[PDB]
Amino acid sequence: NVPHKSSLPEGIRPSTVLRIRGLVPPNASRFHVNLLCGEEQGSDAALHFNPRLDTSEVVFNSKEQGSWGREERGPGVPFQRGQPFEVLIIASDDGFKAVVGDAQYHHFRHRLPLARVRLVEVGGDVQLDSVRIF
Amino acid sequence: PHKSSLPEGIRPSTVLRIRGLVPPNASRFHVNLLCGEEQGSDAALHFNPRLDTSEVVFNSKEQGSWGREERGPGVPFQRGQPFEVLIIASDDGFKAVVGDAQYHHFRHRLPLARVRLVEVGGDVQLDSVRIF
C-alpha cells in the first residue's frame, strides 16, 4: 500500500478533489498525505496533512526549500485505530478543504501556488484502500 | 422529492456528495441544480440517469424550455445496487463522478452564481446528501 505516490505531471487545477480511503491499523502512530511539487527528495510540500493518533492531533503544515512553515491544527483527531476512513482534499482557489467522514474538518489556506503541485504521496502507519483524483 | 436550499449559492470547487441505491424495478431518477425556490425555475444542471433506455442524460432548462441534451457513455447505475455520485463545480462546468471514475463533464450553460437549490427526486432511494 504505502508509500503510495500519484504523479500529476499536468498538475492539479482548482476544484480538483482528492479522495483517500483506507484503514487506520491497530497500534498506528501517525500517517501523512503530502502534496509535493516534484518527484525529487525534499521537494516543496504545498500541503502536509498529518493525522497523529499517538498524540491525538491533526497537523497541517507546508515546506518550502527545506523549511517547514507554522503548523495549523484541526479540532481533534477524526480517526481511530481499527476504523476505516474517507478523506476528501478539495483544492479551491483559496486553499485546501479537508473533509473527513461526513463533515468538513479544516480549511488550509494556500501558502504555495496550487499550480506547483505535481505529486500526491501517502505514507506512515496507514493501510490504503484507494487514492483517486477527480 | 428531497430538496436542499443554498442561500449564498455555490462557488467553484464545491462538491456535492450523493449516496443511495436504485429500487429493483426503477426506471429513471434525477438530480437538479435550480436557480431558485420557485417552481419551474431555470436549471443549470439536469443529471438524469436512464436505466430503462440504458443511458444518462445531461441538460439544462432555461426560460422553461430544455436545451440540447448531452449523454454520457452507457449507464453506470445497475438496478438494485448502491451508488455514490459526486458533482464537482468548477470554473468550466460540472464534473459528474460516479463510483470511482469521472463519468461526464457538463460545461456551464447558465452562470454558476445563480444556483440556489439542489433537488433530488425520481426512482431513487436517497440515503444522504452532503455539500462540501
Residue numbers in the entry:
A (entry chain A): 2 to 135
B (entry chain B): 4 to 135
The authors write:
pmcHuman galectins (GAL) are oligomeric β-galactosidase-binding lectins assembled from small (∼15 kDa) protomeric carbohydrate recognition domains (CRD). Among prototype galectins, galectin-7 (GAL-7) is recognized for its preferential expression profiles in normal epithelial cells. For example, while extracellular GAL-7 can trigger apoptosis of activated T cells following binding to glycoreceptors via its GBS, it can also bind E-cadherin on epithelial cells independently of its GBS. In this work, we studied the impact of homodimer interface mutations on the induction of Jurkat T cell apoptosis, allowing us to positively and negatively modulate the biological activity of GAL-7 by designing a covalent disulfide bridge (G16C) and destabilizing mutation (G16S) to control homodimer strength, stability, and biological activity.
We finally prioritized individual substitutions G16S and F135S, as they caused the largest ΔΔGB among all remaining variants. Based on our computational predictions, mutations G16S and F135S should weaken GAL-7 homodimer interactions, while formation of a disulfide bridge in G16C could strengthen protomer interactions and favor GAL-7 homodimer stability. We found that both G16C and G16S variants maintain GAL-7 dimer architecture in solution, unlike other protomer interface mutations that likely perturb the hydrophobic core of the dimer interface, resulting in insoluble constructs (e.g., F135S). In contrast, the G16S variant displays 32-fold lower dimer affinity relative to WT GAL-7 (KD = 1.88 μM), indicative of significant homodimer destabilization induced by the mutation. Consistent with our MST results, G16S was found to be the least stable homodimer, with a dimer interaction energy of -11.6 ± 0.1 kcal/mol. Conversely, the G16S mutation weakens GAL-7 stability, inducing a 9.1 °C decrease in melting temperature. Our results show that the G16S mutation decreases the proapoptotic activity of GAL-7, yielding an EC50 of 13.7 μM (95% confidence interval [CI95%] between 10.2 and 18.3 μM) relative to 8.4 μM (CI95% 7.6–9.1 μM) for WT GAL-7. One of the most significant structural rearrangements between WT and G16X apo structures occurs in the local environment of residues 8–17 (loop 1), which exhibit significant atomic-scale deviations in the variants. This local rearrangement of loop 1 involves Gly16 and its neighboring residues, particularly residues Pro10, Glu11, Gly12, and Arg14.
